[PDB]
Amino acid sequence: KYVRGCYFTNWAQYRPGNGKYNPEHYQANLCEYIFYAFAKLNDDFTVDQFEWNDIDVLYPGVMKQKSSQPDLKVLLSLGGWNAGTATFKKMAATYSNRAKFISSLVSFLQQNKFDGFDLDWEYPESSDKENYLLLCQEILAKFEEVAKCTSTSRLLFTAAVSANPKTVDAGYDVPALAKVLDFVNLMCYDFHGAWETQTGINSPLYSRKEDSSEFKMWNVEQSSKYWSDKGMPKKQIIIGLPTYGRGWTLSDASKTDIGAPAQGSSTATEYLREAGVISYYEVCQKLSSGAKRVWDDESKTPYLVQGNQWFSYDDVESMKAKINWIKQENYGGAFVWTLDYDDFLGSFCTEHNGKKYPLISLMQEILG
């Protein structure tokens, strides 16, 4: 009745100390689907592994989890934000280029025992709309062809899609893609971040009265609605849950409101070491240090203040509110980004008595 998904990342193995995330850190029945991020798209449009140890170690490591969760399905994700669109745009522009990518892809999936493919082209533009459609149609066709041919279940085929309606209009033929994609993973996050000069919410459930006109649809609720109205069935919209936060350095540590002015990004944190970004477990460390929390009931998310540092993030209350809203509105489910941001050891946080995956466990718990 409800999809429950989780992104694994193949660079989380390089965090320092207990931030290091390995496939053995996964938990049985946490996720129905594990989206592996990412494969590499070569310049010649062929698919290969991205990290030097995927084929030999990490891919099989994730697959071993099926031993204790037999209907765990694992899909290979290609793209992401770092990858950009340059290869994608070229690869998709001709039938023969997509044929080379598709065929290369089908073979890389079979060899490495994946259950499906997840296209995270971030993002198709006007010039790519029609190409994108054909690319997906042809991926389903080959998958359909391969399945009848080899007498197997068809490979699964999903896309991570843009939550910004202006992009959805530009680059997605939504009714056509509905007929073709299994489901879409709605990236209803990153709505606000340190690229802005004032504090905002990362992933607000609802809009806020103080939002300006350009952002009245930049919430989970209204962005999922937009996909619904463009012709994607609600059951094929899967709601993105962010286990990370974004943060600013406050311009004045006395104005600490949603919208307070900021002079730059939050200082890079101990583990993710990316300025402007905090993992959930890092938040728990900060709480333990007398960082103060503030619920925002309008948007149903918390923020965190400590010194001149201000983070929007997501915790058990905000996650409880979104997943419940997933059920109340009958969207297709939830997915989490990422596994390695939660308190996967269950030792960085203390409010949860040591429960592993305080945040991600909510999916199986509430969505069954």
Numbering used by the authors: 32 to 399
Sentences from the study reporting this entry:
While our in vitro data suggest no direct immunomodulatory effects on, e.g., DC function or T cell activation, we observed disease amelioration to be associated with suppression of eosinophil recruitment into the lung and increased numbers of alternatively activated RELMα+ lung macrophages.
X-ray crystallography revealed the structure of the nematode enzyme to be highly similar to the host's own chitinases. Our data indicate that the structural similarities between the parasite and host chitinase contribute to the disease-ameliorating effect of the helminth-derived chitinase on allergic lung inflammation.
